[PDB]
Amino acid sequence: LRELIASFVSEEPPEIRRIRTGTVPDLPGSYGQYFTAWDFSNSIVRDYAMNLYQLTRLATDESVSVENLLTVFRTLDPIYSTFLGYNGFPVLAEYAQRVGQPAESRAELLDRLTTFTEYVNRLTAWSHHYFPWDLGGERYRYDPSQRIPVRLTWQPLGVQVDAEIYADLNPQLATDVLKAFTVLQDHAVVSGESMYAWAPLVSVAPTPVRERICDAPVGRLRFSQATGNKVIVQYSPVLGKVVDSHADRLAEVGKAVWESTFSSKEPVWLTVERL
Amino acid sequence: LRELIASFVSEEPPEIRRIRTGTVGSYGQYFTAWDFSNSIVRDYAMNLYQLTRLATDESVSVENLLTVFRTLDPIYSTFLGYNGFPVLAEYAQRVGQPAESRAELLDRLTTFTEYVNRLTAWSHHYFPWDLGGERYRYDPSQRIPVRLTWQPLGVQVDAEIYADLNPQLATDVLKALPFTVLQDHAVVSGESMYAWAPLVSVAPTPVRERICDAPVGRLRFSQATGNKVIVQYSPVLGKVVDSHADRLAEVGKAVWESTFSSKEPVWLTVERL
Numbered sequence A: 001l002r003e004l005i006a007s008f009v010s011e012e013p014p015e016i017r018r019i020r021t022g023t024v025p026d027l028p029g030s031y032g033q034y035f036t037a038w039d040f041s042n043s044i045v046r047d048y049a050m051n052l053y054q055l056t057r058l059a060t061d062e063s064v065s066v067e068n069l070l071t072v073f074r075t076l077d078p079i080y081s082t083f084l085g086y087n088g089f090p091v092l093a094e095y096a097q098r099v100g101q102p103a104e105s106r107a108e109l110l111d112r113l114t115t116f117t118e119y120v121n122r123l124t125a126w127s128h129h130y131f132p133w134d135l136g137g138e139r140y141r142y143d144p145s146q147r148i149p150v151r152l153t154w155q156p157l158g159v160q161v162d163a164e165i166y167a168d169l170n171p172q173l174a175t176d177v178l179k180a181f182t183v184l185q186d187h188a189v190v191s192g193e194s195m196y197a198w199a200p201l202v203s204v205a206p207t208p209v210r211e212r213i214c215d216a217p218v219g220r221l222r223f224s225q226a227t228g229n230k231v232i233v234q235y236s237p238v239l240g241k242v243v244d245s246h247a248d249r250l251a252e253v254g255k256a257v258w259e260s261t262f263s264s265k266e267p268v269w270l271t272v273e274r275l
Numbered sequence B: 001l002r003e004l005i006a007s008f009v010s011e012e013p014p015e016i017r018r019i020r021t022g023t024v025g026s027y028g029q030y031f032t033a034w035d036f037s038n039s040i041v042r043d044y045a046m047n048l049y050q051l052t053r054l055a056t057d058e059s060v061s062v063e064n065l066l067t068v069f070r071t072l073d074p075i076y077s078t079f080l081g082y083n084g085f086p087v088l089a090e091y092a093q094r095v096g097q098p099a100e101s102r103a104e105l106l107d108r109l110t111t112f113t114e115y116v117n118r119l120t121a122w123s124h125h126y127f128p129w130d131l132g133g134e135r136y137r138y139d140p141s142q143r144i145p146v147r148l149t150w151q152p153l154g155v156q157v158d159a160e161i162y163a164d165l166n167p168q169l170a171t172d173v174l175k176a177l178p179f180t181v182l183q184d185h186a187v188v189s190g191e192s193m194y195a196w197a198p199l200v201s202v203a204p205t206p207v208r209e210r211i212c213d214a215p216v217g218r219l220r221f222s223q224a225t226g227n228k229v230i231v232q233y234s235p236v237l238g239k240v241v242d243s244h245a246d247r248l249a250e251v252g253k254a255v256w257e258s259t260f261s262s263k264e265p266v267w268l269t270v271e272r273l
């Protein structure tokens, strides 16, 4: 599986192509319209994914017996598995059955859960990028020691900015984030002026320090292990802050990426490297 | 909750109305917030139904059950509460509170499921699937006869519930009869209509059948997906009689024009015969 997670960090998965073009073998969508089909594909795998992560996060809970975990999986999974497998994602289903296979140990289950979560998280990301959220706008309107420095670069925007990430604030989270990335950049479609990208990792570490996003300042950085393994730049568990001096570019980086996921479907990639 | 469940079976919830009128999104549009509300309620519903089914299982403690709830629920509950369904959230919080009997939980779970499944039913009906429509194109001794009718289309048909095929499912659905609910169409599956029946059945479904094998007039149940009643013009339930199968074509036409376009409610009543 991991081979194709890596493949799909660079390339759009073929599954996410047939869905946008309407070439799914089943031709889903009653009365010759795959708009409904596409919608179900996007949402079913997004929520299926959030489920997978939480299943994982309980694989880390030891009060639950692994056998009880496997059973909660055989209960929750098959409906999402089969429908997605019949509406655009055949392999994900088979791999879900591989995850449901008896776990000789708790760690084996945990590893399968996290791999597969990230597989479907990459697919979620790509669908999120190509789903036409635009039809709506036309009609429906209204310790200083531990801070590590890194640099975030948006191409082909050619805009770079710097950021600190407070390892002290969220140690387990920051270490996992530091462990790893050039990934497609997209915009939140309901929250407002924020962008996020699907970081290539599966962190189940608890986050003691979270912030209410209305208190969050500009260029605030946040990682959501739940809605993807997303990294979020606000122009919630907190990760870091883009330095104030460069906050002046984030706003147009925003408008650009909003056009990316709302209007253009033109890829906008974001790289995080550590200074 | 049950108070609200009954009230909603006939009346549009306030929540679905304010979201579909955008009087609860990014850059002054609500269609994304709507797409999210619709899908998250639908899927929180499937999750709740599988969690009740879990609640029947005796291998899992009620404390392990409650912690699997305390983790999978909030991501859906709190979010939906921000966009459309606040009371859904507060009641989810309360379902989580420590239960001392499997039954107490299982009851709150089932009512909450069905509350959410009605919210889903109304969301599916009002949700706009017409937008992409222009952009994206191409023992007989055992069965118990009942009858179905659609108003204001004024069309009826007699059908038989195969108790022999699914005894548990048959009883669970009959005990709700008579009822009259919203009938909507199947937006992805094809030529099938369905309606959200007012029950939450944990009945086994020993017999199931390919929807491609399902004849015209095939009645199937959808306990896994909103405990719905599906007529095809899957767990098996019944069949409309051969001489009445012909009357199903135009009501499917009208109900597709109802769910896809008009939104003018189409109601179906099922009564025992």
Ligand SMILES: O=C(O)CC[C@@H]1N[C@H](C(=O)O)Cc2c1[nH]c1ccccc21
Binding pocket: A187, A188, A189, A190, A191, A192, A227, B040, B075, B076, B079, B082, B083
């Ligand atoms: O405060 C908000 O509106 C939501 C914040 C964030 N925004 C995303 C977007 O805007 O696309 C969608 C999304 C978010 N959090 C979630 C939790 C569960 C399921 C979906 C989401």
Ligand SMILES: O=C(O)CC[C@@H]1N[C@H](C(=O)O)Cc2c1[nH]c1ccccc21
Binding pocket: A040, A044, A079, A080, A083, B185, B186, B187, B188, B189, B190, B225
């Ligand atoms: O569409 C299909 O081929 C599947 C059959 C059914 N059809 C529904 C429709 O058409 O609205 C959508 C739907 C179905 N089963 C599901 C399971 C999970 C999530 C959604 C669904």
